[PDB]
Structures are given as structure tokens and as C-alpha cells.
Design a binder for this molecule. Structure first.
Ligand SMILES: O=C(Nc1ccc2c(c1)CNC2)c1cc(F)cc2[nH]ncc12
Lengths: 156, 39
């Protein structure tokens, strides 16, 4: 149905009324979201249908209609923008300087902005406008707030 | 059944609200894609 490049809301009519479950990026005819939002289930776009193509629970990523297309990366120095799309609220660019998630397999960028779980899948952008990762997978810190990793896939 | 609706364009906005800190945290990622803090 709607294949225009841009940011989209992921909704469901299974609960009370229409409930936003997450967010995702349409780019090059591919819908990119976080796995925990759809669980790999098929999506609807008006009268059309989006079937999953690639998915991975550990990476917590999933693509629809084709392979992952997002390949930009955080440079480790520059500030970034979280294009937060919160439930029932308009899309909004929040600029921040990310922290680091230090792991046994390497370091990852991390946005320390707190948002409802339904914001999951919101793109994190660089100054060029390129999607460098997705918001929605991180941790709950000492003060109860959420710090999300900058989760990026691999382009083949 | 899940469905999608367009929410906007993907553009960098100049003079956007600048908030948030940059913390360095020790984390672990399990086979279920879940992060946890290490201390
Ligand atoms: O719960 C959240 N994220 C999540 C859920 C389920 C799973 C994963 C991540 C990866 N493995 C399965 C969440 C996301 C968010 F954007 C803001 C939040 N504030 N408190 C919580 C969350």
C-alpha cells in the first residue's frame, strides 16, 4: 500500500482501541523495525501486506519486503538526533550526545532519552539525515530511567 | 493484526530541543536480545 520513504507508527487493534506497539523506518521499499515490536508477524499498510524478510532476536531487528538497508554509523564524537515518535504524540527531533554501552564484544553508542515502550523503533539520525540505528533496546539504570543502545543492522 | 501509518519525514532539524546525558555503562547482552547492567 504505502511504500513512501519515511518514519511510520506500528499499531494494533487487538487491545482496547488502537494501541501503538512501536515505530519503524521505510527506506528503499523495506520496512525496518525492532523485533520485539512485531515478533516477526506480518504487517498491513492500507490494503497491502508486508511480509518479513530477515529477522534476529539477539540483534532485536527485523526487515519487511527486503534485506536490511540502513548502513550508517555513529562516529563516536558527534551529537545525534532521536526522531522520537511517541504514542498519540507528533514526531519530534530530540538532539543529544550519546554515551557508551561497553560490552564483551565491543562498544556501542547509547541514547539516554527516556520514552514509553511504544516509541521502540524510532530512528536515531546523524547531521546528514542518515539513520545510524534504532531506539528501543537498552537498560533501566539506578534511577529507573531508560538508556537505549543505537541498534544498527548489516547491509549485504 | 498489526498495521502501519506514516508519522513524518526523516530529516535532521536545526535548533531542535537538545537534552540528555552521555553515560558510560557496563552491559551484557543475552541470547534473547536483552541487555543487563554489569557492576
Ligand atoms: O521494553 C522495552 N524494550 C524491549 C522490550 C522487549 C524486548 C527488548 C527490548 C529486546 N528483547 C525483547 C522498552 C523500550 C523503550 F523504547 C523504552 C522503554 N522503557 N522501559 C522499557 C522500554
Amino acid at each position: 500500500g504505502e511504500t513512501t520513504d519515511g518514519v511510520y507508527r506500528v499499531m494494533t487493534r487487538r487491545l482496547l482501541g488502537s494501541t501503538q506497539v512501536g515505530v519503524g523506518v521505510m527506506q528503499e521499499g523495506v520496512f525496518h523495525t525492532m523485533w520485539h515490536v512485531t515478533k516477526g508477524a506480518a504487517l498491513r499498510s492500507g490494503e497491502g501486506r508486508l511480509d518479513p524478510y530477515w529477522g534476529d532476536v539477539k540483534q532485536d531487528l527485523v526487515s519487511y519486503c527486503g534485506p536490511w538497508k540502513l548502513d550508517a554509523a555513529w562516529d563516536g564524537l558527534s551529537e545525534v538526533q532521536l526522531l522520537a515518535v511517541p504514542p498519540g504524540e507528533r514526531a519530534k527531533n530530540i538532539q543529544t550526545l550519546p554515551g557508551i554501552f561497553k560490552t564483551k564484544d565491543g562498544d556501542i553508542g547509547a541514547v539516554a532519552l527516556d520514552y514509553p515502550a511504544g516509541t521502540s523503533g524510532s530512528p536515531i539520525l546523524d547531521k546528514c539525515g542518515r539513520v545510524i540505528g534504532l531506539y528501543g533496546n537498552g537498560v533501566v539504570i539506578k534511577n529507573g530511567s531508560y538508556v537505549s543502545a543505537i541498534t544498527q543492522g548489516k547491509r549485504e | 493484526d498489526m498495521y502501519i501509518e506514516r508519522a513524518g519525514d526523516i530529516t535532521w532539524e536545526k535548533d531542535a530541543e537538545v537534552t540528555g546525558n552521555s553515560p558510560r555503562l557496563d552491559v551484557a547482552l543475552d541470547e534473547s536480545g536483552d541487555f543487563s547492567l554489569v557492576e
